[PDB]
Design a protein that fits this description.
The complex is a heterodimer of chains A (338) and B (35). Chain A is an alpha+beta fold. Chain A has two domains: 225 residues, Antithrombin, subunit I, domain 2 (Antithrombin, Chain I, domain 2, 2-Layer Sandwich), CATH 3.30.497; 107 residues, Roll (Alpha-1-antitrypsin, domain 1), CATH 2.30.39.10. Chain A is 33% helix and 35% strand. Chain A has a six-stranded mixed sheet, with helices on both faces. The radius of gyration of chain A is 21 Å and the shape is globular. In chain B, strands 2-3 form a two-stranded antiparallel sheet. Chain B is mostly beta strands. In chain B, a hairpin with a 5-residue loop joins strand 2 and strand 3. Chain B contains no helices and three strands. Classes of the chains: A alpha+beta (338), B mainly beta (35). Strand 8 of chain A pairs antiparallel with strand 2 of chain B, so a sheet runs across the interface. Bound molecules: testosterone (TES). Testosterone sits at the interface of chains A and B. Chain B: It is found in: Secreted. Chain B: Belongs to the serpin family. Chain B: This is Alpha-1-antichymotrypsin. Chain B: Although its physiological function is unclear, it can inhibit neutrophil cathepsin G and mast cell chymase, both of which can convert angiotensin-1 to the active angiotensin-2. Chain B: Interacts with DNAJC1.
């Protein structure tokens, strides 16, 4: 839990930096914990260099933790995330879609069900359209219709797809009144704006920290339940400077520096954004290489070195509005014969 | 002199779980109306 948080947060910011590097002008929205869980799931079947590259890419310090420690930690995380709750809707699922003829070690299938909650669905990938619809329906069901087209293309020689989804629906602790939402400017740059519905709250007391060293303002808005949002507002033209300082250490400093403050007015756009990603280049920059090559070692899955990753994809959606927030995401790991 | 927090320029959002310290979602909003 302590070491899982630290590794997952390091991974989150490393992932964020590469996404911005790849597409510097774009909105960003993704689920770190979905991607971490999908790749941890994958590592269950990896061996030797393929394995250690994944665990190190996930930012786990292997001199301080072991493979068994990691998987048990993800098992506990998933159990905690899927606990019943009347305050907030939160769920995460894992699944594996396998060609029926593919022979799987009983140890792999058992550990997948036990540690990651995954069933094993027989899938005829040679009927790619049906196989695609089944996987996308699984994700659509898990995200309550929010993630509809996670799998766009599916090679007919696919042997296995590992899938993780996360669904999140929460109410603001202090919700916005829709009668206070009015069209206002959102500045894309100093001289260009777009018009958006700007929600507002008045006379609210919330955690606040003006970070003069980083030229940004940080506020924490709570959801009902154990979830909250850190909002970070860089001064005009300081986004890239703030992004360069994004790290576990910086988030910890922000968190320790929050103090309750009375805010006269808070203005927040009502918005919905969505992004989908091909994570292949990103994961390679993070050191996850052998799983994609002819030297891939996934013999923990089948007992032979006969599988290799072809593609890792991710899609996420974020919906912010007066009553609360809806967000969901899914990650898929596509695997072929080697 | 009251304080005003106005998210009318690009900002970040980090949705976190106080229980597990998981980051559920991380976002940069550069354009709420971006294609
Ligand atoms: C900031 C925070 C306490 C510190 C946590 C943070 C989540 C990310 C993180 C993980 C770590 O392992 C170091 C401390 C931090 C930075 C938590 C989110 C809610 C809580 O306030």
């Amino acid at each position: 839990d302590r070491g899982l948080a630290s590794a997952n947060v390091d991974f989150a910011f490393s992932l964020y930096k590469q996404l911005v590097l790849k597409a510097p002008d774009k909105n960003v929205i993704f689920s770190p914990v979905s991607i971490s869980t999908a790749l941890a799931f994958l590592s269950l079947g990896a061996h030797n260099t393929t394995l250690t590259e994944i665990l190190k890419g996930l930012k786990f310090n292997l001199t301080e933790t072991s493979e068994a420690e990691i998987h048990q930690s993800f098992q506990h995380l998933l159990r905690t995330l899927n606990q019943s709750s009347d305050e907030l809707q939160l769920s995460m699922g894992n699944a594996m879609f396998v060609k029926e003829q593919l022979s799987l070690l009983d140890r792999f299938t058992e550990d997948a069900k036990r540690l990651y909650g995954s069933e094993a669905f027989a899938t005829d990938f040679q009927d790619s359209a049906a196989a695609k619809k089944l996987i996308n329906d699984y994700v659509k069901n898990g995200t309550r219709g929010k993630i509809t087209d996670l799998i766009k293309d599916l090679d007919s020689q696919t042997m296995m797809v590992l899938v993780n989804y996360i669904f999140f629906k929460a109410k603001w602790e202090m919700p916005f009144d829709p009668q206070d939402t009015h069209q206002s400017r959102f500045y894309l740059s100093k001289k260009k704006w777009v018009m958006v519905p700007m929600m507002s709250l008045h006379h609210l007391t919330i955690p606040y920290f003006r970070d003069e060293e980083l030229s940004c303002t940080v506020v924490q808005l709570n959801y009902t339940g154990n979830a909250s949002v850190f909002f970070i507002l860089p001064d005009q033209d300081k986004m890239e400077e703030v992004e360069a300082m994004l790290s576990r250490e910086t988030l910890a400093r922000w968190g320790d520096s929050l103090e309750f403050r009375e805010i006269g007015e808070l203005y927040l756009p009502k918005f919905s954004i969505s992004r989908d990603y091909n994570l292949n280049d990103i994961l390679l920059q993070l050191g996850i290489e052998e799983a994609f090559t002819s030297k891939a070692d996934l013999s923990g899955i089948t007992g032979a070195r006969n599988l290799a990753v072809s593609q890792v994809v991710h899609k996420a959606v974020l919906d912010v509005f007066e009553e609360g927030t809806e967000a969901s995401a899914a990650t898929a790991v596509k695997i072929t014969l080697l | 002199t009251r304080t005003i927090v106005r998210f009318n320029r690009p900002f970040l959002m980090i949705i976190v779980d106080h229980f597990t310290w998981s980051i559920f979602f991380m976002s940069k909003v550069t354009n709420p109306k971006q294609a």
